[model samples]
Target: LKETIISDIHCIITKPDRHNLITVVVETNEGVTGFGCATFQQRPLAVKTMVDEYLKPILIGKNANNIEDLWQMMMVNAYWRNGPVINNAISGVDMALWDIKAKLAGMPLHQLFGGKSRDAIPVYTHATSDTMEGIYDLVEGFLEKGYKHIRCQLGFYGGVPTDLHTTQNPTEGSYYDQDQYMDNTLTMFKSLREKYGNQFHILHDVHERLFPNQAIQFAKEVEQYKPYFIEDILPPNQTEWLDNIRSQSSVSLGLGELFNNPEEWKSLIANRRIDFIRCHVSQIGGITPALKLGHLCQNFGVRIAWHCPPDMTPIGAAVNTHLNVHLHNAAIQEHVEYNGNTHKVFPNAAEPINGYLYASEIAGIGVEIDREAAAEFPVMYRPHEWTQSRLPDGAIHTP
Candidate 1:
């Protein structure tokens, strides 16, 4: 057990695909190692610097077994807290420490959370197309493969072209219209229900493009089709509007993937304003705080749906699945498979089969990063144009 003392820590930034994925690798004295995903897609370099130059110094020579103490020290040592870069740095270190702890225990990460509560984790994947027929085909293919939950997008949110309806503006940036998106979204649900008869669940993401009042109206109108839940209808800053939205409609709401601090979600979860917490595990720090959040949501009748996307590394996905196994309030997980190089870089990442994700019984997070394969994909810092959304007039739009 003395060999569990921290020896070295470093960050590896790789571009396995379009996004720069940041992974933290921590090694102990006796050749034991652990991996954590600290990926902040837009600012991978910042997170990597924070891990290598800042947080690494704090972990080296410390006892990796002291997960709680280490987590607290990382949080408070910097007087300022919860900034995206800092929290993300802490997240990588915290997850790696937990990985080390679970390995030392000689059991899977979920075992430390009190064993698995379910056989396999139910998952939901997205389907987007330029046309209704394309959406139908995608959804049909998913259903054929045994998926019970599917999110429908009409190429509005970054998949295809946005509605140029009535936008005669000569703008230089990507354009989107709230009215157009809301209408298309409703049409999508209505059409989906009309076509499929709603035996399975249908979900949609507004991507925080609507005003509170508009969101309330959209929710009320879409209730007829019975969506599984509407995600991020309003921006994070407009949380006060949730009470009004909740009172006005029966729509189940999910929010918080953009959140970096507990203050952003504590009240919403405690009061049951939202049905699901859509936090990105690394963005909120790491497994230590995520477990605490799982308990909080569990008590408040809120469910857990940690944000899982293509940009997230396998270590991140594995950790989310491990948490899902132990959380009784675990809702459907967001699913996306990584690229081939990603699988080569980080083998044994959790993957969904027949709409269900399963975790390995092996010790730790059940992921191993191949340094050689990772080296093949070098990191590149480029502007993230997709995030720079705009209105018809080219004014910046919050998403």
Candidate 2:
């Protein structure tokens, strides 16, 4: 058996403007090294400092082969559980351990899990816009690029303010806001289907901005467009409201990217209230916990579609790709083009071909960060402003 030892671990912060990224590199005794990233929104420094001050010492000199054992040690022995700070630290270490194990076995990470189930993982690309004409142009561009699966977000209520997290500031153009902005989003889809026919797959996200009654009305209106899925029509706080919507509409539903605890969604999955289990690898605590979530969803006949956005770093993207390929019940993977600066910092980021992302054959997660580029792009020190809107009546809106 080959000797298993960890030599050193180091953390760094990169590209503080667009998004604060925390990266960890682990070197093994055999001279092989692996990389992982834990970007907890705007707090890259806090995560980096935590790893350097608290987690690194315990990881060095540990056996690199015993990934499961090490994960348990970190979880149980440390006497700390859950939350982004602790979980992000665990994610970095757990990913590196998996990389070492896979390298030793002379296989890719997916193969270690069980090998690929499909030739290519189907992926969904976001086609978002502030207006119907803009959405039309965006969808046309995606279709031109050979993307069969697409998710479209059209401003709601004729751009009226809605209480959704993703779309609150309608006029801001930063994202979308639906404060009476709903202007026939489904009619636009009907027009698209008339022009292009139903060969392509389509999905939509309501951003949990709708009240229960309004959610039912929206679902009913959009059902004829035959969307592959509709996500987060009602906020998670109103999960109990799903029963009302389910009673009215036949359209498929997807939820749970914001959910860190799987137990919160157990009933939804078990009862078949949702057709897809949506979670982020980073938010759900990396590969280990994500795998468990996938397995749980699989048993309930709900397919998994791990959430991917611009915020997910290359390291997180690589892990999601591997998991999607290996897991039997994976339905679709999400992909987004990283900003130019992000690519500069992490040179080996995954590249999109046609519509599908090719799996990396590199020893680790296939992310190689340029320390020089990272140094040039110093960490941005600012708090992530998470705000939404309220109705005219002073009731909280979904933004």
Candidate 3:
């Protein structure tokens, strides 16, 4: 136990693709090393600084195997908790300590959480296009590749139509027409149902672009189509609005992708306001709280659909996979395939087969980073076009 003291901590920010990802590496005195993800695409620099400058000091001399105590220390020591920066910082350190524990135990990460509950975790992938022809082709491609769950999007979250009904003083940002988008959304559901029937589960994301009433109406209209689950129909700030949506319609709703606090989701799960708690694992402070949340959801019959976008590093995705393998309440995982550079940096990263992700039998998180390969691909910053969304009158709209 004395030899497992954390001697040092380091942060790495790399861009293998469109988004910047942060990785935290914790090394023990005995030369054993562990890795954790602190990736926050919008605030990559903030997370890196949190890990390198602040968290490193508190974690350096701590016992590595005391994961829960260390996790609690990081949470309360910060003086403030439940925000993204603090939580993201703690998530990296907490997960890395777990990685060290798993390595010392000579078993995989899931084994540390009372072993496996299932063989492989089922996952859902995105299928997006501007036109019906393109959408159909994309869906066909996913089905041919053995995918049973597909999330369909029409170009953007809200449809980007050609004709504009903008006012003369329209703003410079991209416009989102509510009526046109609603019409197009219904069209999409009708078209897909007619084409594919009930062979595969179809999912859609409102992306919180619509108001509560509008979302409820959309849910009512799409009830006949039987969507697998509609995601983010209402924004995180207005989780209370779910009560209205729940009372009016029976659509399976997935919420909490933007959640930063546990309190926001407690009532939703307790009362069964939403069908799935689709939080990004890293964003919610890693596996420690997630295990607790999983049991709570299991008690209420709420399922989990962890957010695993391309921006989530291999380490973060593996964290989600391990939880999915152990938590019996896991409904589906959001899956994204990393680019070649990312795969190179994480040589042992798991890849999905037939729309399911399997955890490696190796010790720790089953993925290791190549520091040399990582340096070759520097972090690249690009403008996020989605944030520039607005209405026809130039009023800004959340994308």
All models: lDDT? Answer: 0.85, 0.75, 0.85
Q: What CA RMSD would you report for each candidate?
A: 1.9, 3.9, 1.7
lDDT of 1: 0.85
| Residue range 65-124, candidate 3, lDDT tens digits | 888888878888878678888788788877888888889988899998998899989988
Model 1: per-residue lDDT, tens digit, 1-399? 664689999898888887788889999997778889898988888888888888888888998888999999999887888878988888888889888889888999999989988887899998988788889999888899889999898865445345465356556666677787788888898888888996679989888888778888998999888888889988888888888878778888889899997889988888898999999999989999999999999898998899987888888989999999888888878987677888888887767888899977899999967888989998987886757787666678785
Best by lDDT: 1
Return the TM-score for candidate 2, rounded to 2 decimals: 0.88
Estimate TM-scores for all models: 0.96, 0.88, 0.96
Q: For residues 1-399, what per-residue lDDT tens digits would candidate 2 score against the true structure?
A: 576899988887776247777777778989777777676765676677777887788888888887777877876555756666777777777787777777777788888898888766777898887666787788888778878888977655445445555433433322343435334566667766787687678888877777777788888888888889999887767887788778888998998877765566888888878888887666556678888888988898999888777766788788888887889898888887787888888887776667787666766566666888889987767644334354444455666
The number of clashing residue pairs in each candidate reads: 0, 24, 0
Q: What C-alpha lDDT, on a 0 to 100 scale, does residue 257 get in candidate 2?
A: 76
Give me the runs in candidate 1 sitting further than 4 Å from their true place: 156-171
Task: Please give the range of 10 consecutive residues that has the lowest summed lDDT in model 2.
Answer: 167-176
How far does residue 33 in candidate 3 sit from its true spot (Å)? 0.8
lDDT of 3 at 204: 91
